[PDB]
Structures are given as C-alpha cells and as structure tokens.
C-alpha cells in the first residue's frame, strides 16, 4: 500500500486528455478523502467525499485561491462505500475535469484555474488504504 498522504506529481501540470486513475479501498467507517489537484499552494480541484456530514454523504468540490476557498458544488450521487475498493478516474477535458468512479460518469468540475500547466501535483489524503495512483494520456 502507498503511503498516505500521497503525492503524485504531474510533470508539465494538466493537459486534456490526460487520465488520472487513483486504486484504493476505503477504510471502515471512514470519514473523508480528498484528491487536491495543486498549482503551488493554490487547490486547482478539490474532490472531497464526506461520508457523515451531519448523516448524509455528500461529495464536496471547490477551488482554493490565496488560501481562500470558493463556492462549493455539491454532489449527493456517492458511489464509495466504506470498506470496499474503488476506481476513481479523472479526465482532463478543455472545459472541466471529468470524474467516473467504478466505471461510471460521477460529476464534471469547470475550470476555475486556467494555467493547467502549472497543476502539477495530484495530493490523496484520507480514509483509504491506496493501492495506486498513475496517468496516462488517451
Ligand atoms: C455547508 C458549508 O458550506 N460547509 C463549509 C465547509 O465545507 C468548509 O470546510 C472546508 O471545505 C473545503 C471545501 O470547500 C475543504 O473540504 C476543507 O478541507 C474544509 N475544511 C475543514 C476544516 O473541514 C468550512 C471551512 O471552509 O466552511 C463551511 O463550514
Ligand atoms: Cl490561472
């Protein structure tokens, strides 16, 4: 298992298509994990399921800009399960990030940071016991 927090780094930052695949199972009652797609300091996409906020799970997207997180976009279709292996995929696309996970379409995250060259880290963090983390260019 790769030791988490992991760092991926993403050589030239982000391009369309290029596909980020992140293997890992989620511990039992996990709380949250989260992929930062990092420029610098700066959180170009955050993808952030939360497994019990307030006893509904809920996946949290947003950008942080300066330190200063945005607007979130909340999506309430949530295919993890605690305890058990995942697949998530994530696409570059011209216009947002495109994310399946187990195969199937999850939510599209615009582009709020125009430089995708400069996002040039993939930060895991959380819950889950992470098997790999890799991309390719389709
Ligand atoms: C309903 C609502 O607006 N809750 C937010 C809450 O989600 C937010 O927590 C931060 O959210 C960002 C994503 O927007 C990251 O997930 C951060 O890790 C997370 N910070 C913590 C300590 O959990 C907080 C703080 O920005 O503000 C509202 O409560
Ligand atoms: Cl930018």
């Not at 790769?2 to 369309?16: C, T």
């Not at 949250?32 to 170009?44: E, K, P, S």
């Not at 195969?103 to 895991?124: F, M």
Request: hydrophobic share 40%; glycine share 6%.
């Amino acid at each position: 298992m790769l030791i988490v927090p992991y760092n991926l780094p993403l050589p030239g930052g982000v391009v369309p298509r290029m596909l980020i695949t992140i293997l890992g199972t989620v511990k039992p009652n996990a709380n949250r994990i989260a992929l930062d797609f990092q420029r610098g300091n700066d959180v170009a996409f955050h993808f952030n399921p939360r497994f019990n906020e307030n006893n509904r799970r809920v996946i949290v997207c947003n950008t942080k800009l300066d330190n200063n997180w945005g607007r979130e976009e909340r999506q309430s279709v949530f295919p993890f399960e605690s305890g058990k292996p995942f697949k998530i995929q994530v696409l570059v696309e011209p216009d947002h990030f495109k994310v399946a996970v187990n195969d199937a379409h999850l939510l599209q995250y615009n582009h709020r940071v125009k430089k995708l060259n400069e996002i040039s880290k993939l930060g895991i963090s959380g819950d889950i016991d992470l098997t790999s983390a890799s991309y390719t260019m389709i």
